[PDB]
Symmetry: C4
Subunit: 31 residues, 4 copies
């Protein structure tokens, strides 16, 4: 349950690293 | 309630696939 | 509390619309 | 716990600012 929820919000705070870094990839190609 | 919350965090962990893949679309056009 | 949490996950499921649509802006300029 | 969860959903509603603003960076370079 709660600890499922918090350790999904683990995955988001990874996807929101790979968000920033793979934007900063693109802004590389264009900058 | 809890199970609403966890199965929204389902939708985010979809939107955060369609995040990655439609960035990786763009980085296609530019790469 | 819970209902704070679920109606933040309202805001994310908006930001994750404005995510998709303002990527699909960019993929317009490049497509 | 709950207050961990809500103040992670603080960090997301930051990452989802730095989302918007560093897309609007890119859409600068291209607009």
């Amino acid at each position: 349950x709660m600890k499922x929820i918090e350790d999904k919000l683990x995955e988001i705070x990874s996807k929101x690293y790979h968000x920033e870094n793979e934007l900063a990839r693109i802004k590389x190609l264009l900058x």
